[PDB]
Coordinates of C-alpha atoms in Angstrom, one line a residue:
Chain W
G304 CA -40.7 20.6 -57.4
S305 CA -43.6 18.7 -60.5
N306 CA -45.3 19.3 -63.1
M307 CA -46.3 18.1 -66.3
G308 CA -48.2 19.1 -69.8
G309 CA -52.3 18.2 -71.3
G310 CA -51.8 15.3 -73.8
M311 CA -54.5 12.8 -75.8
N312 CA -53.8 9.0 -77.4
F313 CA -55.1 8.7 -79.9
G314 CA -53.8 5.2 -80.5
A315 CA -54.3 2.0 -78.9
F316 CA -51.9 1.5 -76.2
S317 CA -51.4 -2.7 -74.9
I318 CA -49.3 -2.9 -71.9
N319 CA -48.3 -6.6 -70.5
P320 CA -45.0 -6.1 -68.2
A321 CA -43.9 -9.5 -66.9
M322 CA -42.0 -7.7 -63.8
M323 CA -40.6 -9.2 -60.7
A324 CA -38.6 -9.0 -58.0
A325 CA -37.6 -10.1 -54.1
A326 CA -36.5 -7.6 -51.7
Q327 CA -36.8 -6.1 -47.3
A328 CA -39.6 -3.3 -49.0
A329 CA -40.8 -3.8 -52.8
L330 CA -43.7 -1.7 -55.2
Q331 CA -44.7 -2.7 -58.1
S332 CA -47.0 -0.8 -60.5
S333 CA -48.2 -0.8 -63.9
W334 CA -51.1 1.9 -64.8
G335 CA -52.9 2.9 -68.1
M336 CA -53.8 6.5 -69.3
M337 CA -51.8 8.9 -66.3
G338 CA -50.5 8.2 -63.1
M339 CA -47.8 9.4 -60.8
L340 CA -46.4 7.8 -57.6
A341 CA -44.7 9.3 -54.9
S342 CA -43.4 5.8 -53.0
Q343 CA -40.0 6.6 -49.9
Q344 CA -39.4 3.8 -48.7
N345 CA -37.0 4.4 -45.9
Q346 CA -35.4 1.1 -44.1
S347 CA -33.1 0.5 -40.7
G348 CA -32.0 -2.4 -38.5
Chain K
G304 CA -45.2 18.9 -55.0
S305 CA -46.9 17.4 -57.8
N306 CA -49.3 18.3 -60.1
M307 CA -50.3 16.8 -63.8
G308 CA -52.3 18.4 -66.8
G309 CA -56.0 16.4 -68.5
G310 CA -55.2 14.9 -71.3
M311 CA -58.7 12.1 -73.7
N312 CA -57.4 8.3 -75.1
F313 CA -60.0 7.7 -78.0
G314 CA -58.5 4.6 -78.0
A315 CA -58.6 1.2 -76.5
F316 CA -55.7 -0.1 -74.0
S317 CA -55.4 -3.1 -72.8
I318 CA -52.9 -4.1 -69.3
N319 CA -52.2 -7.4 -68.6
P320 CA -49.8 -6.8 -66.1
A321 CA -48.2 -10.7 -65.1
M322 CA -46.6 -8.9 -61.4
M323 CA -44.6 -11.7 -58.8
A324 CA -42.8 -10.3 -56.0
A325 CA -42.4 -12.0 -52.0
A326 CA -40.7 -8.9 -49.3
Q327 CA -40.9 -7.7 -45.8
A328 CA -43.3 -5.1 -47.3
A329 CA -45.0 -5.7 -50.4
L330 CA -47.4 -3.2 -52.0
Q331 CA -48.4 -4.4 -56.1
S332 CA -50.9 -1.7 -58.5
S333 CA -52.6 -1.7 -61.8
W334 CA -55.1 0.9 -62.8
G335 CA -56.8 2.1 -65.9
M336 CA -57.5 5.4 -67.0
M337 CA -55.8 8.0 -63.6
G338 CA -54.8 7.0 -60.5
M339 CA -51.6 8.3 -58.1
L340 CA -50.4 6.0 -55.0
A341 CA -48.5 8.0 -52.4
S342 CA -47.2 3.8 -50.4
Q343 CA -44.8 4.8 -47.5
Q344 CA -42.7 1.6 -46.7
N345 CA -41.1 2.5 -43.1
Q346 CA -39.8 -0.5 -42.1
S347 CA -36.6 -1.6 -39.0
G348 CA -35.7 -4.9 -36.6
Chain G
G304 CA -48.8 17.5 -52.2
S305 CA -51.0 16.1 -54.9
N306 CA -53.4 16.7 -57.6
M307 CA -54.3 15.6 -61.4
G308 CA -56.4 17.4 -64.4
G309 CA -59.6 15.5 -65.3
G310 CA -59.4 13.0 -68.7
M311 CA -62.2 11.4 -70.7
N312 CA -61.0 8.4 -71.8
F313 CA -64.0 6.6 -75.2
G314 CA -62.0 3.2 -75.7
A315 CA -62.6 0.4 -74.4
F316 CA -59.7 -0.5 -71.4
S317 CA -59.5 -4.6 -70.8
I318 CA -57.4 -5.0 -67.5
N319 CA -56.4 -8.5 -66.3
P320 CA -53.4 -8.0 -64.2
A321 CA -52.6 -11.6 -62.3
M322 CA -50.5 -10.2 -60.1
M323 CA -49.2 -12.7 -56.9
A324 CA -46.7 -11.4 -53.2
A325 CA -45.9 -13.6 -50.4
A326 CA -44.7 -11.0 -47.4
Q327 CA -45.3 -9.9 -43.8
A328 CA -47.2 -7.2 -45.1
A329 CA -49.6 -7.1 -48.4
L330 CA -51.5 -4.6 -49.9
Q331 CA -52.2 -5.8 -53.9
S332 CA -55.0 -3.4 -55.7
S333 CA -56.9 -3.8 -59.4
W334 CA -59.0 -0.4 -60.5
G335 CA -60.7 0.8 -63.1
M336 CA -61.4 4.3 -63.8
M337 CA -60.4 6.3 -61.5
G338 CA -58.2 5.5 -58.0
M339 CA -55.8 7.2 -55.2
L340 CA -54.3 4.5 -52.7
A341 CA -51.9 6.1 -49.7
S342 CA -51.1 3.0 -48.3
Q343 CA -48.2 3.0 -45.1
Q344 CA -47.2 0.2 -44.6
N345 CA -44.6 0.6 -40.9
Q346 CA -43.6 -2.7 -39.4
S347 CA -41.1 -4.1 -36.6
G348 CA -40.7 -7.2 -34.6
Chain P
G304 CA -52.8 16.2 -48.9
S305 CA -55.0 14.0 -52.3
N306 CA -56.8 15.4 -55.3
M307 CA -58.7 14.3 -58.7
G308 CA -60.0 15.8 -61.7
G309 CA -63.8 14.4 -62.7
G310 CA -63.6 12.3 -65.6
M311 CA -66.2 11.0 -68.0
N312 CA -65.3 7.0 -69.8
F313 CA -67.2 6.5 -72.4
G314 CA -65.8 3.3 -73.2
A315 CA -66.4 -0.1 -71.6
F316 CA -64.0 -1.1 -69.2
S317 CA -63.8 -4.9 -68.1
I318 CA -61.2 -6.2 -65.9
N319 CA -60.6 -10.0 -64.5
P320 CA -57.9 -9.5 -62.6
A321 CA -56.8 -13.1 -60.6
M322 CA -54.6 -11.9 -57.6
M323 CA -53.0 -14.4 -54.8
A324 CA -51.0 -13.6 -51.7
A325 CA -50.4 -14.7 -48.6
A326 CA -49.0 -12.7 -45.0
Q327 CA -49.0 -11.7 -41.6
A328 CA -51.6 -8.7 -43.2
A329 CA -53.2 -9.2 -46.3
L330 CA -55.5 -6.6 -47.8
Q331 CA -57.2 -7.3 -51.4
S332 CA -59.9 -5.2 -53.7
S333 CA -60.6 -4.7 -57.3
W334 CA -63.0 -1.2 -57.8
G335 CA -64.6 -0.1 -60.4
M336 CA -65.2 3.7 -62.3
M337 CA -64.0 5.1 -58.6
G338 CA -62.3 4.4 -54.8
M339 CA -59.8 5.8 -52.9
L340 CA -58.2 2.9 -50.7
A341 CA -55.9 4.7 -47.4
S342 CA -54.6 1.3 -45.7
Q343 CA -52.2 1.3 -43.2
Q344 CA -50.8 -1.7 -41.7
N345 CA -49.0 -1.5 -38.7
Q346 CA -47.8 -5.2 -36.9
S347 CA -45.4 -6.6 -34.1
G348 CA -44.3 -9.5 -32.6
Chain M
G304 CA -56.2 13.7 -47.3
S305 CA -58.3 12.9 -49.5
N306 CA -60.6 13.9 -52.0
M307 CA -62.2 12.9 -55.5
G308 CA -64.0 14.3 -58.7
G309 CA -67.0 13.7 -60.2
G310 CA -67.6 11.1 -63.0
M311 CA -70.7 10.1 -65.4
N312 CA -69.4 6.0 -67.0
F313 CA -71.3 5.7 -70.2
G314 CA -70.1 2.6 -70.8
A315 CA -70.4 -1.2 -69.0
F316 CA -68.1 -2.5 -66.8
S317 CA -67.6 -6.1 -66.1
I318 CA -65.3 -7.3 -62.8
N319 CA -64.9 -10.3 -62.2
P320 CA -61.3 -11.3 -60.1
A321 CA -60.7 -14.3 -58.6
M322 CA -58.5 -13.3 -55.3
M323 CA -57.5 -15.6 -53.3
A324 CA -55.0 -15.0 -50.1
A325 CA -54.4 -16.9 -46.9
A326 CA -53.0 -14.3 -43.5
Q327 CA -53.4 -13.4 -39.5
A328 CA -54.9 -10.3 -40.8
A329 CA -57.3 -10.7 -44.4
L330 CA -59.9 -8.5 -45.9
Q331 CA -61.2 -9.2 -49.8
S332 CA -63.0 -6.3 -51.3
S333 CA -64.5 -5.8 -55.0
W334 CA -67.1 -2.7 -55.8
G335 CA -69.1 -1.8 -58.5
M336 CA -69.2 2.6 -59.8
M337 CA -68.4 3.7 -56.5
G338 CA -66.1 3.1 -52.8
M339 CA -63.9 4.6 -50.4
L340 CA -62.1 1.4 -48.0
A341 CA -59.7 2.5 -45.1
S342 CA -59.2 -0.3 -43.5
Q343 CA -56.6 -0.2 -40.4
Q344 CA -54.6 -3.7 -39.6
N345 CA -52.7 -3.6 -36.4
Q346 CA -51.5 -6.7 -35.4
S347 CA -49.4 -8.1 -32.6
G348 CA -48.4 -11.2 -30.7
Chain U
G304 CA -60.6 13.2 -43.8
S305 CA -61.8 10.8 -47.1
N306 CA -64.2 12.6 -49.4
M307 CA -65.8 12.1 -53.0
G308 CA -67.7 13.1 -56.1
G309 CA -71.1 12.4 -57.4
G310 CA -71.1 10.4 -60.7
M311 CA -74.0 9.0 -62.8
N312 CA -73.2 4.9 -64.3
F313 CA -75.8 5.2 -67.6
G314 CA -74.7 1.4 -68.6
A315 CA -74.6 -2.0 -67.1
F316 CA -72.2 -3.4 -64.4
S317 CA -71.8 -6.9 -64.3
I318 CA -69.5 -8.2 -61.0
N319 CA -69.1 -12.0 -60.1
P320 CA -66.0 -12.3 -57.7
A321 CA -65.0 -15.3 -56.9
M322 CA -62.8 -14.3 -54.1
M323 CA -62.0 -17.0 -51.3
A324 CA -59.6 -16.5 -47.6
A325 CA -58.7 -18.5 -44.5
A326 CA -56.9 -15.8 -41.9
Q327 CA -57.6 -15.3 -38.1
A328 CA -59.5 -12.4 -39.1
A329 CA -61.3 -12.5 -42.0
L330 CA -63.6 -9.8 -43.9
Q331 CA -65.0 -10.4 -47.8
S332 CA -67.1 -7.5 -49.0
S333 CA -68.8 -6.8 -52.9
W334 CA -70.9 -3.3 -52.9
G335 CA -73.3 -2.5 -56.1
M336 CA -73.0 1.6 -57.1
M337 CA -71.8 2.5 -53.7
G338 CA -70.0 1.6 -50.5
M339 CA -67.7 2.9 -48.1
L340 CA -66.3 0.0 -45.3
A341 CA -64.3 1.6 -42.8
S342 CA -63.0 -1.9 -40.9
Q343 CA -60.2 -2.3 -38.4
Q344 CA -59.3 -5.9 -37.4
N345 CA -56.7 -5.2 -34.4
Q346 CA -55.8 -9.0 -33.0
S347 CA -53.5 -10.6 -30.5
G348 CA -52.1 -13.7 -29.1
Chain B
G304 CA -81.2 -18.2 -86.3
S305 CA -81.0 -14.0 -84.8
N306 CA -79.7 -11.9 -82.0
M307 CA -79.0 -8.5 -81.9
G308 CA -76.9 -6.4 -79.5
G309 CA -77.7 -3.3 -77.4
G310 CA -77.6 0.1 -77.3
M311 CA -78.1 3.9 -74.9
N312 CA -79.2 6.7 -76.8
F313 CA -79.7 9.6 -75.2
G314 CA -80.3 12.5 -78.5
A315 CA -83.8 13.1 -79.7
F316 CA -84.8 11.7 -83.0
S317 CA -87.4 12.2 -85.4
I318 CA -88.4 10.3 -88.3
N319 CA -90.6 11.2 -90.8
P320 CA -91.0 8.5 -93.3
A321 CA -93.8 9.3 -95.9
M322 CA -93.8 6.9 -98.7
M323 CA -96.7 5.5 -101.2
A324 CA -96.7 2.6 -103.2
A325 CA -99.5 0.0 -105.7
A326 CA -100.4 -2.7 -103.2
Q327 CA -101.1 -6.3 -105.0
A328 CA -100.0 -6.9 -100.7
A329 CA -98.4 -4.1 -98.9
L330 CA -96.7 -3.7 -95.7
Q331 CA -95.9 -0.2 -94.7
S332 CA -94.3 -0.4 -91.2
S333 CA -92.7 2.9 -89.2
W334 CA -91.2 2.4 -85.3
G335 CA -89.1 4.8 -82.1
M336 CA -86.4 3.6 -80.4
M337 CA -86.8 -0.1 -81.1
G338 CA -88.6 -2.9 -83.1
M339 CA -88.5 -6.5 -84.7
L340 CA -90.7 -7.1 -88.2
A341 CA -91.0 -10.2 -89.4
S342 CA -93.1 -10.8 -92.3
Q343 CA -94.5 -13.1 -95.5
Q344 CA -96.4 -12.0 -98.2
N345 CA -96.7 -15.3 -100.2
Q346 CA -99.4 -15.4 -102.3
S347 CA -101.2 -17.9 -104.9
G348 CA -103.9 -17.6 -108.3
Chain O
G304 CA -77.0 -18.0 -88.2
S305 CA -76.3 -13.9 -87.6
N306 CA -75.2 -11.9 -85.0
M307 CA -75.3 -7.8 -83.5
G308 CA -72.3 -5.7 -81.2
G309 CA -73.7 -2.9 -79.0
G310 CA -73.5 1.0 -80.3
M311 CA -74.5 4.0 -77.9
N312 CA -75.3 7.6 -80.1
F313 CA -75.7 10.6 -77.5
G314 CA -76.1 12.5 -80.8
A315 CA -79.0 12.9 -82.4
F316 CA -80.5 11.6 -85.7
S317 CA -83.5 12.8 -88.1
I318 CA -84.9 10.3 -90.6
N319 CA -87.2 11.6 -93.6
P320 CA -86.4 8.0 -95.7
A321 CA -89.5 9.4 -99.2
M322 CA -89.9 6.1 -101.6
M323 CA -92.4 4.8 -104.0
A324 CA -93.3 1.7 -105.7
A325 CA -95.0 -0.4 -107.7
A326 CA -96.3 -3.9 -106.0
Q327 CA -97.0 -7.3 -107.1
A328 CA -95.7 -7.6 -103.3
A329 CA -94.0 -4.7 -101.5
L330 CA -93.1 -3.8 -98.6
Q331 CA -91.8 0.0 -97.2
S332 CA -90.0 -0.4 -93.3
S333 CA -88.9 2.6 -91.3
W334 CA -86.9 2.7 -87.9
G335 CA -85.5 5.0 -85.5
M336 CA -82.0 3.6 -82.4
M337 CA -82.6 0.1 -83.4
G338 CA -84.4 -2.4 -85.4
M339 CA -84.3 -6.0 -87.4
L340 CA -85.8 -6.8 -90.0
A341 CA -86.4 -10.5 -91.9
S342 CA -89.3 -10.9 -94.7
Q343 CA -89.1 -13.4 -97.5
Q344 CA -92.3 -12.3 -100.5
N345 CA -92.6 -15.9 -102.2
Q346 CA -95.5 -15.9 -104.3
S347 CA -96.8 -17.9 -106.8
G348 CA -99.3 -17.9 -110.6
Chain T
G304 CA -72.7 -17.6 -89.6
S305 CA -72.0 -14.0 -89.5
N306 CA -70.6 -11.7 -86.4
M307 CA -70.6 -7.5 -85.8
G308 CA -68.7 -5.6 -84.1
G309 CA -69.6 -2.6 -81.5
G310 CA -69.1 1.2 -82.1
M311 CA -69.9 4.0 -80.4
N312 CA -71.4 7.3 -82.4
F313 CA -71.7 10.7 -80.7
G314 CA -72.5 13.0 -83.5
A315 CA -75.3 13.9 -85.6
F316 CA -76.9 12.0 -88.1
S317 CA -79.1 12.8 -90.6
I318 CA -80.7 10.6 -93.4
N319 CA -83.1 11.0 -96.4
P320 CA -82.3 8.1 -98.4
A321 CA -85.6 8.4 -101.5
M322 CA -85.7 5.7 -104.1
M323 CA -88.7 4.4 -106.8
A324 CA -88.4 1.2 -108.9
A325 CA -91.3 -1.5 -110.1
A326 CA -92.0 -3.8 -108.6
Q327 CA -93.0 -8.4 -108.7
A328 CA -91.6 -8.2 -105.5
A329 CA -89.5 -5.2 -103.5
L330 CA -87.9 -4.6 -100.4
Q331 CA -87.1 -1.2 -99.8
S332 CA -85.9 -0.1 -95.4
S333 CA -84.0 2.7 -94.0
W334 CA -82.9 3.1 -90.2
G335 CA -81.0 4.9 -87.7
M336 CA -78.4 4.0 -85.1
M337 CA -78.8 0.4 -85.5
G338 CA -80.5 -3.1 -88.1
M339 CA -80.4 -5.7 -89.7
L340 CA -81.7 -7.2 -92.6
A341 CA -82.3 -10.7 -93.7
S342 CA -84.7 -10.6 -97.0
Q343 CA -86.1 -13.9 -99.8
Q344 CA -88.3 -12.4 -102.3
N345 CA -87.9 -16.3 -104.0
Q346 CA -91.0 -16.0 -107.0
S347 CA -92.5 -18.7 -108.8
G348 CA -94.5 -19.0 -112.3
Chain V
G304 CA -67.8 -17.5 -92.3
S305 CA -68.2 -14.2 -91.5
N306 CA -66.6 -10.5 -88.3
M307 CA -66.4 -7.2 -87.8
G308 CA -64.4 -4.8 -86.2
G309 CA -65.3 -2.0 -83.6
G310 CA -64.9 1.8 -84.7
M311 CA -66.3 4.6 -83.1
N312 CA -67.1 8.1 -84.9
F313 CA -67.3 11.9 -83.0
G314 CA -67.8 13.3 -86.2
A315 CA -71.7 14.1 -88.2
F316 CA -73.2 11.7 -91.6
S317 CA -75.4 13.5 -93.5
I318 CA -76.2 10.7 -96.5
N319 CA -78.7 11.4 -99.1
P320 CA -79.2 8.1 -100.8
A321 CA -81.1 8.6 -104.0
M322 CA -81.7 5.3 -106.3
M323 CA -83.9 3.7 -109.1
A324 CA -84.5 0.6 -111.3
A325 CA -86.5 -2.1 -112.8
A326 CA -88.0 -4.6 -110.5
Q327 CA -88.1 -8.7 -111.5
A328 CA -87.3 -8.9 -108.1
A329 CA -85.2 -5.3 -106.4
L330 CA -84.5 -5.1 -103.3
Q331 CA -83.0 -0.8 -101.7
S332 CA -81.9 -0.2 -98.4
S333 CA -80.0 2.9 -96.5
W334 CA -78.8 2.9 -93.0
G335 CA -76.9 4.4 -90.4
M336 CA -73.9 4.6 -87.7
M337 CA -73.9 -0.1 -88.8
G338 CA -76.1 -2.4 -90.2
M339 CA -75.6 -6.8 -91.5
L340 CA -78.1 -7.0 -95.2
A341 CA -78.5 -10.5 -96.2
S342 CA -80.2 -11.4 -99.0
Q343 CA -81.1 -14.3 -101.7
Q344 CA -83.2 -12.9 -104.0
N345 CA -83.6 -16.6 -105.7
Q346 CA -85.8 -17.1 -108.8
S347 CA -87.2 -19.4 -111.1
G348 CA -90.2 -19.2 -113.4
Chain S
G304 CA -63.8 -17.3 -94.1
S305 CA -63.7 -13.4 -93.9
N306 CA -61.8 -10.9 -91.3
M307 CA -62.5 -7.5 -90.3
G308 CA -59.9 -4.4 -88.0
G309 CA -61.2 -1.6 -86.7
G310 CA -60.9 2.5 -86.9
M311 CA -62.1 5.5 -85.6
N312 CA -63.6 8.6 -87.2
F313 CA -63.7 11.5 -85.5
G314 CA -64.3 13.5 -89.5
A315 CA -67.2 14.7 -90.7
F316 CA -69.3 12.3 -93.9
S317 CA -71.3 12.7 -96.3
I318 CA -72.3 10.2 -98.5
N319 CA -74.9 10.9 -101.7
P320 CA -74.4 7.2 -103.9
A321 CA -76.9 8.2 -107.1
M322 CA -77.9 5.0 -108.7
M323 CA -79.8 3.7 -111.1
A324 CA -80.0 0.4 -113.0
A325 CA -82.3 -2.6 -114.9
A326 CA -83.1 -5.4 -112.5
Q327 CA -83.7 -9.3 -113.1
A328 CA -82.2 -9.2 -110.1
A329 CA -81.3 -5.9 -108.7
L330 CA -79.6 -5.6 -104.9
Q331 CA -79.2 -2.0 -104.0
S332 CA -77.6 -0.4 -100.7
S333 CA -76.5 3.1 -99.4
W334 CA -74.1 2.8 -95.4
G335 CA -73.3 5.2 -93.3
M336 CA -70.0 4.6 -90.0
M337 CA -70.2 0.6 -90.4
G338 CA -71.8 -2.4 -92.6
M339 CA -71.9 -5.8 -94.2
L340 CA -73.8 -7.1 -97.0
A341 CA -73.0 -10.5 -98.2
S342 CA -75.7 -11.3 -101.2
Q343 CA -76.3 -14.0 -103.6
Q344 CA -79.0 -13.4 -107.3
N345 CA -79.3 -17.3 -108.1
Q346 CA -82.0 -17.5 -110.5
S347 CA -83.2 -20.1 -113.2
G348 CA -85.7 -20.6 -115.8
Chain R
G304 CA -58.8 -16.9 -95.4
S305 CA -58.8 -13.3 -95.4
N306 CA -57.7 -10.8 -92.8
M307 CA -57.8 -6.3 -92.5
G308 CA -55.7 -4.3 -90.6
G309 CA -56.5 -1.2 -88.5
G310 CA -56.5 2.7 -89.8
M311 CA -58.0 5.7 -88.2
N312 CA -58.8 8.8 -90.0
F313 CA -59.6 12.3 -88.4
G314 CA -60.2 14.2 -91.7
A315 CA -63.5 14.3 -93.2
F316 CA -64.4 12.5 -96.6
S317 CA -67.0 13.8 -99.3
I318 CA -67.9 10.5 -101.3
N319 CA -70.4 11.0 -104.8
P320 CA -70.4 7.8 -106.3
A321 CA -73.2 8.0 -109.2
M322 CA -73.4 4.6 -111.1
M323 CA -75.6 3.1 -114.6
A324 CA -76.0 -0.6 -115.0
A325 CA -77.6 -3.6 -117.1
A326 CA -78.9 -5.8 -114.6
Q327 CA -79.8 -9.9 -115.1
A328 CA -78.1 -9.9 -112.2
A329 CA -76.8 -6.7 -110.9
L330 CA -75.3 -5.9 -107.1
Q331 CA -74.6 -1.2 -106.9
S332 CA -73.6 -0.7 -102.8
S333 CA -71.3 2.5 -101.4
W334 CA -70.7 3.0 -98.1
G335 CA -68.7 5.5 -95.2
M336 CA -66.0 5.1 -93.0
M337 CA -65.8 1.0 -93.0
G338 CA -68.0 -2.5 -94.5
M339 CA -67.6 -5.7 -96.4
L340 CA -69.0 -7.2 -98.8
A341 CA -69.0 -10.8 -100.1
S342 CA -71.5 -11.3 -103.1
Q343 CA -71.6 -14.3 -106.0
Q344 CA -74.6 -13.7 -108.9
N345 CA -74.6 -17.1 -109.6
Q346 CA -77.5 -17.4 -112.8
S347 CA -78.9 -20.8 -114.9
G348 CA -81.0 -20.9 -117.9

């Protein structure tokens, strides 16, 4: 169960994330005003 | 279960994420005002 | 289950993400005002 | 299950993503005001 | 299941994505106001 | 299942994507106001 | 050298520019959404 | 050398510029959403 | 050398610039959302 | 050399700039959301 | 060399700049949300 | 060399700058949210 409240950002954000990663499974994400990522990585072998 | 509240960003965002990644499975994403990514990576072998 | 609330961005975004990735499976995405990407990468071998 | 709320972007976006990727399967996308990409990459061998 | 809400972009977008990719299967896309790409790449051998 | 909401872009877009890609299967696309591309690339050998 | 930018006005305008003057040489002008005036009243006696 | 930026006004304007003057050489002007005036009243006797 | 930035005004304006003056050479001007004036009243006797 | 920044005003403006003056050479100006004036009243006798 | 920063004003402005003066050379100006004035009244006798 | 910072004002302003003066050369100015003035009244006799 997930819920969130409304918000208004007057200021100016800058997001410059230099991510890096090596894996059997990899996901990389960088979003602006709003986002919900529900990623399920189930692996075998 | 996922829910979010409405928001209004008056300011000007800039997002310059220099992501990098090597994997059996890879997903890369960078979105502006709003996005929901539901990625399921299930692997075998 | 996924839901989101309405939003109005008055400001001017700029998104210059220099992504890079090598994989058995690869997806790359960069969207503006709104997007939902539901990518399932299931691999074998 | 995916749903999104309506939004009106008064500001002017610029998106210059220099993506690059080599893979068995590859998808690359860069969209403006709105898009939903549901890509399933299932591979074997 | 996918659904989206209506939106009106008053501002002027510019999208100059210099994508590049080599693969067994490759898809490249860059769209303006709205698009939904549902690409399934299933490979063997 | 895919659905989208109506939108009216008052501003003037410019899209100059310099895409490039070499593959067993290749698709390249760049559309203006609206488009839905459903491409299935199934390969063997 | 001179140059101008672009603006879109969806609101409604009502201009009522009353004016009066003497005239050894006189220019009087009124205009709506757009207009450029370059005048030189060079006189000799 | 001169240059200008771009602005979009969705609100409504009402201009009533009354004016009066003497005139060995006189310029009078009024305009709405946009306009550039460059005048030189160079006189000799 | 001169340059300008960009602004968007959703509020409503009402300008009533009354003015009066003598005139060996006189310039009078009024404008709405945007405008650039460059004048040189160079006189000789 | 000159330069300017960008501002967005959602509030409403009301300007009433009354003025009066003598004039061996006179400039009078009034403007709304944006405007740049560069004048040189260079006189000789 | 000159430069400026960016500001967003959601409040409402009301300017009433009354003024009067003598004029061997006179400049009078009033403006709303934004404006840059550079004037040189260089005179000779 | 000159430079400026950025400020956002959500409150409402009311400016009434009355002024009067003699004028062998006179500059008078009033402005709202933002503005830069650079003037040189260099005179000779």
